[PDB]
Amino acid sequence: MEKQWWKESVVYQIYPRSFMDSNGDGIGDLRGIISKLDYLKELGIDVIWLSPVYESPNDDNGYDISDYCKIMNEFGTMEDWDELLHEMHERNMKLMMDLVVNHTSDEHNWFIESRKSKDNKYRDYYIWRPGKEGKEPNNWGAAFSGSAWQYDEMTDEYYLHLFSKKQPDLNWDNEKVRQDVYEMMKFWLEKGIDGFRMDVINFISKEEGLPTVETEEEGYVSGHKHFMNGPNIHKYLHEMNEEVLSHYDIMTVGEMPGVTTEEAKLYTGEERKELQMVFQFEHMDLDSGEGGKWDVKPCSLLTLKENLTKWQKALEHTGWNSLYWNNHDQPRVVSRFGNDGMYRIESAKMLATVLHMMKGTPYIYQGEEIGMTNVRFESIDEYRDIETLNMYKEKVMERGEDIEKVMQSIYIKGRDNARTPMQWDDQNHAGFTTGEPWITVNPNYKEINVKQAIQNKDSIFYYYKKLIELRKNNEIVVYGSYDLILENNPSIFAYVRTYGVEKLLVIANFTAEECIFELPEDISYSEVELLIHNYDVENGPIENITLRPYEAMVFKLK
């Protein structure tokens, strides 16, 4: 509806632990980020979203928080943080913090007290329930394997953890908890931050009674149907909005596994007073099968464009879309949807075109701008993620599955694909650290790194930079409507942005083969201007264009 700064922004996501190390320990830190500030400003970034930088035991690298108001030891001190905020605000950049409030670390004070006894005041800050028969309260399973219930002898009850045992879920039906969380939010808002990325916020409201999932299965099954977009989820987000969010000029985005376009309208509708946008996973689950993310399935361009188009259309008149290809939980784009071999540069540019020319706020994950690829370590010992390691024990050690197959799904879906060190140059550890990295740097850093990309004007870095510039300088790319053309073409992803009398025609070849683009007779123009292109083209007319492999181009008509 209304023009908003956060509607016009480009966000860059940084995973602190793998961004830049400035003190020789092999783990990235705050001072390291500060030193790259000018690099990000060159790209054209407006907002920087930092994965968690709070005090944490690191069972899930930051998402298991023991103290919300202190900086993680490995990242620095609060003083390093204050300097980051200032140096960012000095430039015209905004800082968005990750808000992890569905759960805390089991080493957080609230939980320390909570477990002591049943008549403890912090007892109902968490979800404690007695066993049913001699088993857990219900049959839900946790994200990184096993039961979602952990037994505690102190009280002879189980506490709920949708994630690891060390990440017990907060009880949001308790207003003291909500009040406390709001208190903690204002603490960071008073420091001058410009936003919140909310970790699994649609998981926050559980269904009364924590029901067992009606099933004939053997072990633990997902209870997602009973916590995913819970009975009081809209009341809590709107409450949060009245009490905290509305008081500050900030931007918000909720990460929401399982949300639908219709729920997204309720979550993001300007007049609903809840959130500004959400990260949906529909496009991230297109290549997973029946058995979840590890049950890899091929994904065609048709399934992809239909899905992206659907979200484009659903939030055209209400709400606002977020646009992203990857993050710290997903494999890298050029490897997933592109070609990371012979056409790594072309396909990376192609994928950036497709997503950056749509309606909504785009998010760039560190490394995306230089075309970072997935990693293939030959041994499970080189991988670090709880999820991958736990999945490996279960499938290989408990179910007795083939190591080779298990490793193949890790190569395709493992989160570590996204966490190997940022590749700055061709020096020892891609210039990330002078010590030894917490995780091995992808061997391809010798050809794929920031200095190489910055000295070659035909690199992915420069392509992303132009894409961002176009967006800043053309209102149509932010506010224009969206309409998919050539809907059933199995090779070409094409669409039109309309805003006033102008139009943008975006054409993308998603294959390694040459194909023909035929402009629909429906579209009529008189003036044509080539905006960006990943191949050398003196294009005109645009009625019939032969697209080279992974070729992509954007035109402004009239």
From Swiss-Prot:
GO terms for molecular function: alpha-amylase activity; metal ion binding; oligo-1,6-glucosidase activity. It is found in: Cytoplasm. The record marks D329 as: Transition state stabilizer. Transmembrane segments: none annotated. The active site is at D199 (nucleophile), E255 (proton donor). SMART domains: Aamy. Its EC number is 3.2.1.10. This is Oligo-1,6-glucosidase. Belongs to the glycosyl hydrolase 13 family. It catalyses: Hydrolysis of (1->6)-alpha-D-glucosidic linkages in some oligosaccharides produced from starch and glycogen by alpha-amylase, and in isomaltose. Its main location: cytoplasm. It comes from the Bacteria. GO terms for cellular component: cytoplasm. Coiled coil: none annotated.
